[PDB]
């Protein structure tokens with residue numbers, strides 16, 4: 001039904017919000033510290049000197065294990 | 071259809087995986103450091119001396135800003 005299409009859309013959008021903002025291909029699993037923006041996979045987070053969201057300096061990257069990880 | 075009910079269940083499970091494993095009421099927005107388990111809201115994470123997933127001591131809690139975050 002049309003309701004099935006609406007639910008399919010919500011699921012797709014939520015899953016896309018879990019992907020890296022830089023490569024769009026890998027799951028987010030890294031946090032820029034101390035700002036806390038958690039928007040990248042490990043490979044894209046590795047070379048950023050400043051946070052791509054708020055421009056704060058990245059002192060280090062913390063790896064994150066999320067229950068949503070698939 | 072039956073597929074509507076199946077998608078409703080997948081959406082419910084995905085939304086529940088984004089809620090605190092301790093209170094089940096607030097969104098996950100905190101990471102236990104250094105282990106990295108990100109399973110609680112800030113209120114539950116502030117009350118734990120050891121990680122509830124791996125039992126490592128919590129040196130500190132890092133707040134996380136996730137693109138999935140929701141709010142009224």
Ligand SMILES: C[C@H]1COCCN1C(=O)Cn1ccc(C(F)(F)F)n1
Pocket residue numbers: 065066067068107108109123
């Ligand atoms: C990814 C796996 C295997 O590598 C190291 C240990 N791992 C985890 O801790 C995965 N994990 C279990 C529970 C969670 C949780 F934090 F998301 F709940 N992540």
Ligand SMILES: [Zn+2]
Pocket residue numbers: 020021022023024025026040041042043044045
């Ligand atoms: Zn990436």
Ligand SMILES: [Zn+2]
Pocket residue numbers: 032035036037051052053054055056
């Ligand atoms: Zn930032």
Ligand SMILES: [Zn+2]
Pocket residue numbers: 090091092093094095096110111112113114115
């Ligand atoms: Zn909680």
Ligand SMILES: [Zn+2]
Pocket residue numbers: 102105106107121122123124125126
């Ligand atoms: Zn842990």
